[PDB]
Amino acid sequence: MLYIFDLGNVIVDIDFNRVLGAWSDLTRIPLASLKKSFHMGEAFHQHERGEISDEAFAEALCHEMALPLSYEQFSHGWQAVFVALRPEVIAIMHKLREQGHRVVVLSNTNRLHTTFWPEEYPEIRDAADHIYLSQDLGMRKPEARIYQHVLQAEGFSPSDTVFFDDNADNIEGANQLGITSILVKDKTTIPDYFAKVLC
């Protein structure tokens, strides 16, 4: 089988509230202001597909949220994003591969050239056969093309692929291609699913 794992809130817990915290710390903008104004716009989508620079992205979000930050200060806060490994999942992924299933990561990512980000974590690189990243591909979930890219480059069909994502639109994109798609509701979803599959 081909197993495709999303990264954020699938392999790792990730919380951008910590970034808002960090930017609130520097700017003294009340945290509640940054929460009501931090939105997943087109600038996000473009930056995910690598279509605009890190600097242009910073500029977009700063204008949206009225952040008087330099690029460097922006990045500095960006770096604070809360990331915690789910070791249960890293282990399952290693086990799937030593049983000779194929295990890849597929991630929409807003990494910057100046930040250290989860797809760069050694524990995540060593758990995966390949890591597919939106900025590298010029594509993002839930666009058909990105799923197709992975199917094609891995050499598997939809019916022979299972995909895990905590985002329902992402799941929908994969389903339209007849990929088996498991919504990740919580910590248990992947351990439960692989109870009977590893045995």
Binding site for a copy of itself (CB under 8 A): 18, 21-22, 25-26, 31, 72, 75-77, 79-80, 82-84, 114-116, 120-122
Q: Tell whether residue 37 is among the known ligand binding residues.
A: no
CB count, 10 Å around CB of 136? 13
**Interaction partner, residue 121 (a copy of itself, Ca ion, Mg ion, none; CB < 5-8 Å by kind):** a copy of itself
Q: Which is nearer to a copy of itself, 15 or 143 (CB)?
A: 15
Question: In the annotation, is 169 catalytic?
Answer: no
Q: Which of residues 119-158 bind Mg ion (CB under 5 A)?
A: none
For 60, 70, 111, the CA distances from 75, given in Å and listed in that order, are 13, 9, 10
Distance CA 56, CA 62 (A): 10
Q: Which is nearer to a copy of itself, 18 or 101 (CB)?
A: 18
Least separation, in Å, of the C-beta of 47 and Mg ion? 16
**Interaction partner, residue 166 (Ca ion, Mg ion, a copy of itself, none; CB < 5-8 Å by kind):** Mg ion
DSSP conformation letters of the chain:
-EEEE-SBTTTEEEETHHHHHHHHHHH---HHHHHHH----HHHHHHHTT-S-HHHHHHHHHHHHT----HHHHHHHHTT-EEEE-HHHHHHHHHHHHTT-EEEEEE-----TTS--GGG-HHHHTT-SEEEEHHHHT--TT-HHHHHHHHHHHT--GGGEEEEES-HHHHHHHHTTT-EEEE--STTHHHHHHHHHH-
- What is the contact surface with Ca ion in residues (CB under 5 A)? 25, 116
**Interaction partner, residue 72 (Mg ion, a copy of itself, Ca ion, none; CB < 5-8 Å by kind):** a copy of itself
Q: Which is nearer to Mg ion, 69 or 119 (CB)?
A: 119
Q: Tell whether residue 136 is among the known ligand binding residues.
A: no
Q: Which is nearer to a copy of itself, 31 or 144 (CB)?
A: 31
Q: Tell whether residue 183 is among the known ligand binding residues.
A: no
**Interaction partner, residue 48 (Mg ion, a copy of itself, Ca ion, none; CB < 5-8 Å by kind):** none
Instruction: Please list the active-site residues.
Output: 6
Positions at the binding site for substrate: 6-8, 107-108, 141, 166
Positions at the binding site for Mg(2+): 6, 166
